[PDB]
Design a protein around this ligand. Structure first.
Ligand code: 3VV
Ligand code: FE
Ligand code: FE
Length: 321
């Protein structure tokens, strides 16, 4: 019990789907067209990529990287799971980086996630993997949420995020933030700083980039809940897919993370394909993050022995941490 600070992300196994047949999905047509156009505009930006100035590509990667941290170190580990404490400067960089990533504000992000952990693979899970790959990748954003999500998730404590002034600052002014950070500024910066043509900055440095931060994130719900190993808990659906960790800068050890949702590393190994933990460990070094809550090797090993599927004994002691 390394974090009794909060407890609204611990898996509740007593909950199961027991409300009769699931109501039919309700399509939301505003989202469908935008998500279509986006992945078109992202796809069109791909054929444009060879005709881009070098700085435009690097800027895109940096922007992909910064938005990544705004979700992995920011929304996921700091605010949804409370796995460490951050000082004002880092939290300001994170709250901006989050706004470039455009995955709703932080209060609405963590609520959907805190429900995803507690009520995983149920109708109260906002991206119920058991509905299918498409649903949990992008489809959950195109149809209405099961009443279980609203009902059960509404009973989760969000007092901590309610009582943080910076998370609520984002919430109040989120609409102008995302327009500036996700679409306007990463288009005008390449357009001015090194003269990338507007058609390229819009479709490479914005639509493709956002489409790649978007899809890289959705792979943690779709792929990580189907393909991979289960060294730590064979009884859940979260997996250790290494590719996911690569694109999602560390959040690919979903089987560990769903078992140990309080570990600040989201993984057994601190720096292994986990650029996010590395970043978090640098802020630690600079005195802007402390109380990095990692799980003891005895608790992990005993948990592998209990509910593990036994694939771990091909990674047993390959890094110190
Ligand atoms: C490279 C980085 C890698 C990162 C790796 C991360 C791994 C982390 C671990 C695992 C993965 C986590 C990643 C998932 C996050 C991805 C998020 C995005 O990508 S968003 C893209 C842009 N934004 C949209 O596209 C919005 C589209 N969504 C919508 O339009 C609606 O939300 C929609 C259609 C999905 C649902 O429609 P409805 O009307 O049925 O539900 P509604 O409108 O959202 O909520 C209304 C009321 O329902 C309650 N309610 C909803 N959700 C609740 C909850 N979770 N708990 C309690 N009550 C809830 C609340 O009362 C809420 O009202 P009140 O928000 O307070 O004003
Ligand atoms: Fe998950
Ligand atoms: Fe999580």
């Amino acid at each position: 019990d390394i974090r009794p600070e909060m407890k609204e992300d611990i898996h509740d196994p007593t909950y199961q789907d027991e409300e009769g047949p699931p109501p039919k999905l309700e399509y939301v047509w505003r989202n469908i067209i935008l998500m279509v156009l986006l992945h078109l505009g992202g796809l069109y930006g791909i054929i444009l990529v060879p005709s881009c100035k070098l700085y435009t590509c690097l800027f895109g990667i940096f922007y992909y990287m910064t938005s990544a941290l705004g979700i992995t170190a920011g929304a996921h580990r700091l605010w949804s799971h409370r796995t460490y404490k951050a000082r004002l400067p880092l939290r300001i960089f994170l709250i901006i980086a989050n706004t470039m990533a455009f995955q709703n504000d932080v209060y609405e992000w963590a609520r959907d996630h805190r429900a995803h952990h507690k009520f995983s693979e149920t109708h109260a899970d906002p991206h119920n993997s058991r509905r299918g790959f498409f649903f949990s990748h992008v489809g959950w954003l195109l149809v209405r949420k099961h009443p279980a999500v609203k009902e059960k998730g509404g009973k989760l404590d969000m007092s901590d995020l309610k009582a943080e002034k910076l998370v609520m600052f984002q919430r109040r002014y989120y609409k102008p933030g995302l327009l500036l950070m996700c679409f306007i500024l990463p288009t005008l910066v390449p357009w001015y700083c090194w003269g990338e043509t507007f058609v390229n900055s819009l479709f490479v440095s914005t639509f493709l980039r956002y489409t790649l931060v978007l899809n890289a994130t959705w792979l943690v719900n779709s792929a990580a809940h189907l393909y991979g190993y289960r060294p730590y808990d064979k009884n859940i659906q979260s997996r250790e897919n290494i590719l996911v960790s690569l694109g999602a800068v560390g959040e690919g050890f979903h089987n560990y993370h769903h078992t140990f949702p309080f570990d600040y590393s989201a993984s057994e190994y601190r720096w292994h394909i986990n650029f996010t933990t590395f970043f978090i460990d640098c802020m630690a070094a600079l005195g802007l993050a402390y109380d990095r809550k990692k799980v003891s090797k005895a608790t992990v090993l005993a948990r592998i022995k209990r509910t593990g599927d036994g694939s771990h004994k091909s990674s047993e002691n390959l890094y110190f941490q």
